[PDB]
Amino acid sequence: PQITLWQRPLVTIKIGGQLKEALLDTGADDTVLEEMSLPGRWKPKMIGGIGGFIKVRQYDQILIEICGHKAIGTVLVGPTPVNIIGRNLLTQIGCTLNF
Amino acid sequence: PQITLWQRPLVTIKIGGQLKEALLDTGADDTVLEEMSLPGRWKPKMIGGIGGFIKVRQYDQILIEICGHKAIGTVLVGPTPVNIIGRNLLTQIGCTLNF
Numbered sequence: 001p002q003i004t005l006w007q008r009p010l011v012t013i014k015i016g017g018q019l020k021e022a023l024l025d026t027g028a029d030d031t032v033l034e035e036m037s038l039p040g041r042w043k044p045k046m047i048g049g050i051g052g053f054i055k056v057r058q059y060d061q062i063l064i065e066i067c068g069h070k071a072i073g074t075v076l077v078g079p080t081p082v083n084i085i086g087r088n089l090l091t092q093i094g095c096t097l098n099f
Numbered sequence: 100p101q102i103t104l105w106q107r108p109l110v111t112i113k114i115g116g117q118l119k120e121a122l123l124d125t126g127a128d129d130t131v132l133e134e135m136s137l138p139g140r141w142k143p144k145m146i147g148g149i150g151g152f153i154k155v156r157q158y159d160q161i162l163i164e165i166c167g168h169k170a171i172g173t174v175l176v177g178p179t180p181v182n183i184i185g186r187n188l189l190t191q192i193g194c195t196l197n198f
């Protein structure tokens with residue numbers, strides 16, 4: 001669909017069978033989700049943004065559904081104030097910025 | 100144009116007569132630019148990012164060209180890693196997310 005930016009581009013995502021609200025963030029290299037449990041091994045990682053760095057846990061090969069579209073990729077879990085769907089997954093659903 | 104997200108959506112912007120690279124950031128409510136000189140008085144503003152909050156200087160009615168599209172709006176200047184073009188300006192250039 002076509003999402004306007006008058007409001008934050010929040011969409012519903014399905015991950016781990018859980019429905020969550022996440023932000024489609026073209027400014028995010030990675031996908032960062034709030035603290036949650038994911039299966040498998042993870043690697044510690046520091047990701048920076050506005051305000052500095054936060055420590056997150058990196059999970060690879062994670063399946064996420066974004067507006068019906070399935071996508072696979074790395075997901076970072078940590079104390080982020082909002083769920084962020086970064087470019088690593090936006091590319092997988094054919095998301096493009098247009099004007 | 101149509102921008103894919105396999106790489107950061109960096110574009111050249113023109114502000115204060117200078118060229119700078121900035122990120123088309125749908126995850127940003129506001130436009131935040133790296134430390135620079137702008138005219139007029141500024142007002143304080145606290146903005147939150149993934150790593151916490153930062154104090155920024157808010158300048159209003161600032162002329163900024165984004166990929167040839169002239170925009171005039173609020174710009175925040177502060178300790179940001181990269182120049183961020185947020186929704187306040189993305190909407191002025193008719194930018195939308197599509198997939």
Ligand SMILES: CNC(=O)[C@@H](NC(=O)[C@H](OCc1ccc(-c2ccsc2)cc1)[C@H](O)[C@@H](O)[C@@H](OCc1ccc(-c2ccsc2)cc1)C(=O)N[C@H](C(=O)NC)C(C)C)C(C)C
Pocket residue numbers: 023025026027028029030032047048049050081082084122124125126127128129131146147148149180181183
């Ligand atoms: C490599 N690192 C990245 O790609 C990071 N990208 C960014 O931080 C983007 O910023 C460009 C950016 C790119 C590279 C580096 C970088 C780092 C190290 S080397 C390069 C630093 C910054 C991003 O889209 C921000 O803009 C936006 O983050 C989402 C967000 C939205 C609402 C709240 C939130 C907070 C309180 S309630 C909701 C909290 C967070 C955000 O902070 N939005 C703010 C906002 O809208 N707040 C409401 C806005 C005022 C700036 C990833 C890991 C998240």
